[PDB]
Amino acid sequence: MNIQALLSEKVRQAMIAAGAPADCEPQVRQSAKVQFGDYQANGMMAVAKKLGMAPRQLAEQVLTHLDLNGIASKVEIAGPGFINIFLDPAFLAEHVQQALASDRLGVATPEKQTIVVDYSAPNVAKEMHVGHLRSTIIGDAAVRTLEFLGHKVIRANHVGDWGTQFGMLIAWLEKQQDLEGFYRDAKKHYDEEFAERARNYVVKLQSGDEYFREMWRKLVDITMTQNQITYDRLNVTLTRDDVMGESLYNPMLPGIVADLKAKGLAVESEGATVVFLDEFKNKEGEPMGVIIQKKDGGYLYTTTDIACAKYRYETLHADRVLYYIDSRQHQHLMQAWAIVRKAGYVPESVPLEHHMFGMMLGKDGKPFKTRAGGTVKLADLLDEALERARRLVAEKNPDMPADELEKLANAVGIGAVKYADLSKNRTTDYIFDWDNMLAFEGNTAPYMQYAYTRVLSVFRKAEIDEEQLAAAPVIIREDREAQLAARLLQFEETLTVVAREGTPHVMCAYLYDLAGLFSGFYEHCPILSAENEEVRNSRLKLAQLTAKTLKLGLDTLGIETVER
Numbered sequence: 001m002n003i004q005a006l007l008s009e010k011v012r013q014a015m016i017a018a019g020a021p022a023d024c025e026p027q028v029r030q031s032a033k034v035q036f037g038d039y040q041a042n043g044m045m046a047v048a049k050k051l052g053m054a055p056r057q058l059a060e061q062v063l064t065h066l067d068l069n070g071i072a073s074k075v076e077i078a079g080p081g082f083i084n085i086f087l088d089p090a091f092l093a094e095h096v097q098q099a100l101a102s103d104r105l106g107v108a109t110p111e112k113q114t115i116v117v118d119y120s121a122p123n124v125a126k127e128m129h130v131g132h133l134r135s136t137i138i139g140d141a142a143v144r145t146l147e148f149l150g151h152k153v154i155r156a157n158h159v160g161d162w163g164t165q166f167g168m169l170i171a172w173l174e175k176q177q178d179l180e181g182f183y184r185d186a187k188k189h190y191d192e193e194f195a196e197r198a199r200n201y202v203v204k205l206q207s208g209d210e211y212f213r214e215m216w217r218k219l220v221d222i223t224m225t226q227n228q229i230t231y232d233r234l235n236v237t238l239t240r241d242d243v244m245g246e247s248l249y250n251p252m253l254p255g256i257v258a259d260l261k262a263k264g265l266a267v268e269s270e271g272a273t274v275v276f277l278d279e280f281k282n283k284e285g286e287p288m289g290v291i292i293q294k295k296d297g298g299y300l301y302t303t304t305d306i307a308c309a310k311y312r313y314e315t316l317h318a319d320r321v322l323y324y325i326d327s328r329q330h331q332h333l334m335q336a337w338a339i340v341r342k343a344g345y346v347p348e349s350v351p352l353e354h355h356m357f358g359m360m361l362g363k364d365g366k367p368f369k370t371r372a373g374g375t376v377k378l379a380d381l382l383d384e385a386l387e388r389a390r391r392l393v394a395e396k397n398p399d400m401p402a403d404e405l406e407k408l409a410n411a412v413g414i415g416a417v418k419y420a421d422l423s424k425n426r427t428t429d430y431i432f433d434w435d436n437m438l439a440f441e442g443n444t445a446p447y448m449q450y451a452y453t454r455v456l457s458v459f460r461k462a463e464i465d466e467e468q469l470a471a472a473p474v475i476i477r478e479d480r481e482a483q484l485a486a487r488l489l490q491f492e493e494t495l496t497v498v499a500r501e502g503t504p505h506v507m508c509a510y511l512y513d514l515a516g517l518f519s520g521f522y523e524h525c526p527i528l529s530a531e532n533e534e535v536r537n538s539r540l541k542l543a544q545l546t547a548k549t550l551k552l553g554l555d556t557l558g559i560e561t562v563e564r
């Protein structure tokens with residue numbers, strides 16, 4: 001089910017038998033080149049230098065404690081201590097059929113966990129922007145993957161629905177009785193007497209006053225109604241039942257600042273309440289004063305990220321929390337989490353992980369503006385995708401838009417938006433590019449969609465006998481068959497990487513190499529016929545699992561499929 005995992009524990013045990021410590025790293029990775037096998041163990045030389053050994057020498061001794069019959073057709077040593085592993089065709093055929101039996105493609109369902117995923121997290125009365133856009137795509141993908149792996153995934157849309165800014169906004173709403181336009185006019189008129197009533201409305205909302213709280217509800221509702229619509233178009237799994245905004249934590253904030261002083265916390269600096277963290281000393285060596293409650297009395301983004309962590313453990317019972325937030329907030333998160341753990345609000349088991357991403361830029365590095373400038377309106381981005389997508393899919397037209405073409409342009413358009421983001425490593429600044437992403441040539445949503453259709457057409461347009469095809473025997477004899485078969489089987493371990501590291505681009509690179517391997521399997525390897533039905537069925541069974549694997553793999557990234 002997980003070849004790398006299986007091999008990795010066997011190599012570690014051999015090593016251990018050779019004198020290696022218990023915590024040794026076999027370093028079994030997928031082979032870079034087919035002449036090196038399916039997998040190789042890379043970590044011999046490190047241990048060899050500490051065992052007083054030649055890399056080859058250890059590796060050789062290792063290869064004596066290593067029981068790989070039935071698993072690897074052959075296992076040779078190479079270069080300075082590498083162990084190279086060619087998987088046995090039997091083993092491949094057995095696990096390919098076996099995987100063709102589960103609707104899960106044999107992918108294990110590990111010890112279930114409650115995972116909280118903090119993603120998207122826009123702000124009320126401000127326009128949703130590309131950072132939230134990225135957060136939404138990457139986070140949703142992680143949600144889908146973890147959901148497929150079996151876990152109770154709790155979506156936590158951490159909306160910025162609290163802050164001094166509302167006093168101004170709510171006042172402007174009152175006088176009124178374009179999200180961008182609303183804030184600006186309130187801003188100008190607050191500055192342009194507005195200001196007193198608006199600070200005084202910030203106090204009034206802080207305290208009960210249902211008149212105000214309804215107004216705050218009405219504002220939150222306008223922003224979240226619009227965003228949900230964006231979420232819908234993006235076929236993202238976020239729903240309004242998943243909104244867990246900063247507001248949610250207000251009631252517990254004085255309970256926390258209170259607890260923290262009981263250890264733990266200083267009224268030092270200019271009044272206010274600061275935790276001082278020696279981990280974050282100034283260059284002069286002055287500890288970082290992280291304010292959790294101002295002299296003004298109001299609380300802060302830090303306070304609310306503390307509560308939110310404490311809450312997710314104490315109340316949600318998360319085993320793990322994933323935060324898909326822009327890289328620039330990294331030390332904010334590390335400061336808040338530093339305080340959370342010092343106060344013992346969540347234990348060390350239970351990760352709390354910052355899955356950072358980088359900025360979204362335009363064609364050459366400027367901060368990325370939508371069509372016709374403005375302040376980046378995502379509905380515009382999504383409109384422009386579809387217009388391009390529609391005109392793009394116009395060629396080779398015949399079937400009605402209705403559900404035929406229109407669903408097709410939508411899959412391709414929205415697919416491109418997501419997949420162009422997901423296919424790139426999240427830590428990298430992402431240079432948007434219409435033409436690269438809507439292409440069919442490289443690692444794109446449309447290329448993948450195209451390939452999926454090609455696989456399905458190869459399969460369906462032939463014959464059918466589900467119950468009989470399932471008794472077909474899959475025999476690996478060609479070298480491309482063994483390669484395809486092995487790639488297919490690495491689907492779980494790709495999933496596992498994505499789920500551990502939070503990097504959906506690993507799957508994209510998998511599904512692209514996979515579709516590359518099918519095309520080469522299609523051309524240089526004939527589909528019907530040779531050994532009549534014998535070999536025909538095997539190849540069909542491999543096109544079958546490839547179809548099922550692309551489908552599934554793309555449904556974890558949130559990317560739809562057509563059949564045309």
Ligand SMILES: NC(=[NH2+])NCCC[C@H](N)C(=O)O
Nearest residue numbers: 121122123158159160305325
């Ligand atoms: N737990 C968190 N701090 N989540 C992220 C909140 C991000 C915030 N909504 C923003 O627009 O920047």
